[PDB]
């Protein structure tokens, strides 16, 4: 028995970069990692193999801001490769970015 | 200008003794227009039409005392040290993380 609460969710159009190439809207969220107390995980809901969730410890990921509505994420190996996220609005993207940064500290 | 995120908390000025009253107030983080990529913390006034206090985030000490209790120590000259009590742990945590992410 463990525990894993959702800190923030946002939505973005997500494209794999290695595909060169359609983007699909996805919920991204940050939650407590139930395996590791004090730490956070990033989930991309339904984007894995059998529409499963992609999920990673936050420290295993590299996250960059390319512009106000464009982020990129680098998952650890084994995953989909570099992902591009395009935000509907800049203020949601920026709250998300700062939260990802704070959770990473 | 723009507002990154806001939260409400019951804010009590500690400088004023055990009996100064707590009021529910809005705190928020906004883009510092004079420092691209850095943020200001705003404590909005106790009623509409009041002065809002703002500080560069680096000018402040922000401490977490507990899952629903934080403490803000502004530079001298202002309202003095403030207790903030949150309506629940999740708002408090989301905000604490955001403050930590915003701080450089």
DSSP calls for A27-46? EEEEEE-SSSTT-EEEEETT
User: What was the resolution (in A) of this experimentally determined structure?
Assistant: 2.0
> What is the C-alpha to C-alpha distance for residues A49 and A80, in angstroms, rounded to an integer?
10
| Strand-pair category, A62-67 with A54-57 | unpaired
CA distance A40 to chain B (A): 11
Provide the number of structural domains found in chain A: 1
Residues 6+ apart with CB under 8 A from B53: B42, B43, B74, B78, B79
Torsion of CA B101, A86, B90, A56, to 10 degrees: -80
Which residues, other chains included, contact B45 with Cβ-Cβ below 8 Å and sequence gap of 6+? B25, B51, B52
Are the C-beta atoms of A13 and A40 separated by less than 8 Å? no
Query: Domain of B61: which CATH number?
Result: 2.30.29.30
CB B12 within 8 A of CB B21: yes
How many angstroms separate the CA of residue A47 from the nearest CA in chain B? 25
The residue whose two tokens read 């809901």 is A45
Chain A residue with minimum CA distance to B100: A102
Encoded tokens for A13: 């159009």
Query: Is B4's Cβ below 8 Å from some Cβ in A?
Result: yes
Cα-to-chain-centroid distance, residue B20? 18
Which stretches of B1-104 are DSSP H helices? Answer: 89-102
State the method.
Answer: X-ray
Q: B102 — contact with chain A (CB < 8 Å)?
A: yes
For B89, the domain range is: 1-104
Across the interface, do B97 and A7 touch by the CB < 8 Å criterion? yes
């Amino acid at each position: 028995l463990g525990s894993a609460a959702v800190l923030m969710a946002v939505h973005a159009a997500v494209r794999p970069l290695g595909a060169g190439a359609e983007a699909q809207l996805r919920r991204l969220q940050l939650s407590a990692d139930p395996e590791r107390p004090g730490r956070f995980r990033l989930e991309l809901l339904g984007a894995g193999p059998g529409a499963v969730n992609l999920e990673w410890p936050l420290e295993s990921v590299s996250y960059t801001i390319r512009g106000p509505t464009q982020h990129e994420l680098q998952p650890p190996p084994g995953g989909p490769g570099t992902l591009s996220m395009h935000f509907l609005n800049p203020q949601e993207a920026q709250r998300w970015a700062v939260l990802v940064r704070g959770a990473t500290v």
